[PDB]
Amino acid sequence: VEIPSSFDSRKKWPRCKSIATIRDQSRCGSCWAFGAVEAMSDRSCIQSGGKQNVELSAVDLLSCCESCGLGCEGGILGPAWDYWVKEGIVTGSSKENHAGCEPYPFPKCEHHTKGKYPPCGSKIYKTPRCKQTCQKKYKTPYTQDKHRGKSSYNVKNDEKAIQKEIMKYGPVEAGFTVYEDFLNYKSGIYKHITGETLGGHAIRIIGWGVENKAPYWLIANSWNEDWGENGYFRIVRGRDECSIESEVTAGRIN
Ligand SMILES: *[C@H](CC(=O)N1C(=O)C=C(OC)[C@@H]1Cc1ccccc1)[C@H](C)NC(=O)[C@H](CC(C)C)NC(=O)[C@H](CC(C)C)OC(=O)[C@H](Cc1ccccc1)N(C)C
Ligand code: NA
């Protein structure tokens, strides 16, 4: 396949409303579960030609996956996509939308940036319990609201392989190393210049582009719309910046 010089999943599949939705993980290390349910929502819609047009529940995966790690204390991508294949994930919107089977219990907060939400601060919530119960107004039983995948895989640590995966099958989840300067990001094309490691972050890659000859990935963060470029950031593409090309995971419904 010829790879275009830029690609935006939001523009290829505009009927799939999840693709342009920015979420907020709140005071919780649930990034691993947000990048997962976001990319699964997108891919469920894209691969079903818009038939499965849903917002999958971050709290269902976060609270119920026994193999994914430590809930609000952080997690692992492979087992999140295996959970989607094996048990599936119910629907559920943000806390403020309170739509679907299991909406997120935690409110929007600012992640080391200025804006109109309360600051996240340094304390995290306890991981919610696995309740397996749809909100009272939702009239599908929990187990009947499950959306499943067929396959999950790691994507090759190769720029062109990742571009082909995104443009054919949809946004992907990806891990990268967070250095302190990432917390100062306001706009433009991120690269690590200053600061020590703060650990790992999991995000959603939706496309790519080039500006002033600088190639980038276009990424949806889960820190609400006030963070970065209306909730998005760009990061140098092609040099495995912060290991962005080395921890890509996704999956298919068919
Ligand atoms: C999401 C990322 C996140 O919440 N972050 C940041 O990256 C920067 C932040 O500051 C606002 C937030 C807040 C934060 C909240 C709780 C803890 C730490 C920071 C989460 C935390 N990241 C992950 O889940 C990560 C995803 C990968 C890249 C796919 N994985 C991990 O962090 C693993 C989780 C274990 C295996 C369960 O752990 C590590 O990578 C460890 C840290 C660790 C070790 C033992 C128990 C818990 C965490 N490393 C030493 C980096
Ligand atoms: Na901003």
Numbering used by the authors: 70 to 323
Original authors' sentences:
The component digestive proteases in Schistosoma mansoni (S. mansoni) include the CA clan cysteine proteases, cathepsin B1, cathepsin C (dipeptidyl aminopeptidase I), and cathepsins L1–L3, the CD clan protease known as legumain (asparaginyl endopeptidase), and the clan AA aspartic protease, cathepsin D.11,13,14S. mansoni cathepsin B1 (SmCB1) is a central digestive protease due to its high abundance and dual mode of action as both an endo- and an exopeptidase (specifically, a carboxydipeptidase). This dual activity is enabled by the flexible occluding loop that restricts access to the active site. The occluding loop is characteristic of cathepsin B-type proteases and distinguishes them from cathepsin L-type proteases, which are strict endopeptidases. The inhibitors are located in the active site cleft of SmCB1, which contains the catalytic residues Cys100 and His270 (supported by Asn290 and Gln94) and has restricted access to the primed region (beyond S1′ and S2′ subsites) by the occluding loop (Phe175 to Pro197), a hallmark of cathepsins B.15,17 Gallinamides form an irreversible covalent bond to the thiol group of Cys100 through the Cß atom of the vinyl group of the acrylamide warhead.
The structures were determined by molecular replacement and refined using data to resolutions of 1.20 1.60, and 1.55 Å for the complexes of gallinamide A, 1, and 6, respectively. The P1′ position contains the C-terminal MMP group with various R1′ substituents, including side chains of alanine, leucine, and phenylalanine in gallinamide A, 1, and 6, respectively. Two different conformations were modeled for the phenylalanine side chain in the MMP group of compound 6. In one conformation (labeled A in Figure 4), it is flipped out from the S1′ subsite to S1, while in the other (B), it is directed toward the S2′ subsite. The conformation A appears to be intramolecularly stabilized by a CH-π interaction of the P1′-phenylalanine and P1 alanine side chains. Each conformation is associated with a different orientation of the methoxy group on the MMP ring and a different conformation of His181 on the occluding loop in S2′. A double conformation of Ile193 was observed in the complexes of 1 and gallinamide A, but not in the complex of 6 due to steric hindrance by R1′. However, for 6, we observed a T-shape π–π interaction of the MMP ring in conformation A with Trp292. Not surprisingly, P4 is not involved in significant interactions with SmCB1, except for a hydrophobic interaction of the P4 phenylalanine of 6, which is rotated to approach Leu139 in the S3 subsite.
